[PDB]
Amino acid sequence: VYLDRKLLTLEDKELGSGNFGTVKKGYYQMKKVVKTVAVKILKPALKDELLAEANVMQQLDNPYIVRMIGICEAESWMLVMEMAELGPLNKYLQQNRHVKDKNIIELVHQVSMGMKYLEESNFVHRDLAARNVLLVTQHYAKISDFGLSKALRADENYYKAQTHGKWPVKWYAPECINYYKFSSKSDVWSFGVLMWEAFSYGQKPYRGMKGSEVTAMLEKGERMGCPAGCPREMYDLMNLCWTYDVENRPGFAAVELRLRNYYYDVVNE
Numbered sequence: 001v002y003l004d005r006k007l008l009t010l011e012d013k014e015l016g017s018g019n020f021g022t023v024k025k026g027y028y029q030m031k032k033v034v035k036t037v038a039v040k041i042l043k044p045a046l047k048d049e050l051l052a053e054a055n056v057m058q059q060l061d062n063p064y065i066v067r068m069i070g071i072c073e074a075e076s077w078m079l080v081m082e083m084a085e086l087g088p089l090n091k092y093l094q095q096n097r098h099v100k101d102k103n104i105i106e107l108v109h110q111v112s113m114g115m116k117y118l119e120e121s122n123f124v125h126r127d128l129a130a131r132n133v134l135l136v137t138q139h140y141a142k143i144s145d146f147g148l149s150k151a152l153r154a155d156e157n158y159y160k161a162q163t164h165g166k167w168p169v170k171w172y173a174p175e176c177i178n179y180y181k182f183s184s185k186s187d188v189w190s191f192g193v194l195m196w197e198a199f200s201y202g203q204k205p206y207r208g209m210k211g212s213e214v215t216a217m218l219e220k221g222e223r224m225g226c227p228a229g230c231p232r233e234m235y236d237l238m239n240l241c242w243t244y245d246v247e248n249r250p251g252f253a254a255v256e257l258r259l260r261n262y263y264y265d266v267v268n269e
């Protein structure tokens with residue numbers, strides 16, 4: 001849970017920077033082999049957000065979710081995680097526009113498998129976006145960023161946000177905007193936007209639109225168009241994820257099964 005600074009070796013090259021801080025490559029010396037790791041180095045309120053994130057990550061074990069190695073207190077607070085070398089899905093596809101639909105279907109399916117586990121475990125992610133899916137290889141994706149994530153109470157099936165902070169509104173379902181209600185079916189809406197992103201090769205969704213204009217668009221029943229080259233069955237699945245009414249919107253068991261069948265039917269040719 002708490003790592004040993006002596007055994008942690010960081011490299012001076014920053015992989016990515018932001019408001020959260022920087023991410024760096026490092027090596028953690030285990031029992032025999034050393035393991036390459038990604039280290040989130042936070043630059044009072046900041047400490048509790050990473051501890052809470054760490055406590056969430058510790059509870060989750062799945063091939064399609066980035067694992068936490070532990071936390072370390074040095075000059076800065078550090079969250080040590082499995083390294084996803086190829087980095088964010090959106091930036092990867094922006095720089096590799098020859099990746100084929102069969103490969104994108106595979107990647108989003110792997111995300112549907114990770115979210116299904118999360119749904120089974122009664123965790124809501126609350127920040128599912130192409131920028132938060134990381135590539136271990138071109139054929140292996142992992143969900144990351146659990147800083148907004150909540151373990152649901154054993155008697156409730158949603159989480160009610162009190163504070164309206166800086167929200168990525170374009171990934172958020174209608175009930176998140178109007179009632180601040182976050183459930184696994186809200187993540188399903190975000191997964192729909194993640195699919196559009198994946199098949200649009202890292203294009204921003206609702207481009208040139210403010211968050212209020214998007215809400216108005218969804219309220220008129222309008223939905224983003226089919227990306228160039230995206231198969232019809234995946235776009236139908238996007239639209240199903242963008243079901244306004246939360247009761248008629250599917251959970252990730254249905255979403256993942258839908259993705260599983262179509263992928264195997266696309267393969268074999």
Ligand SMILES: Cn1cc(-c2cccc(-c3cnc(N)c(C(=O)N[C@H]4[C@@H]5C[C@@H]6C[C@H]4C[C@@](O)(C6)C5)n3)c2)cn1
Binds near residue numbers: 020038083131145
């Ligand atoms: C921004 N950026 C990031 C890169 C970038 C480039 C190369 C590798 C990684 C990488 C590898 N293995 C990981 N486990 C994480 C990893 O867990 N990263 C977290 C996630 C959640 C927050 C904080 C932090 C960076 C973020 O992008 C946003 C993903 N990140 C990230 C390029 N640009």
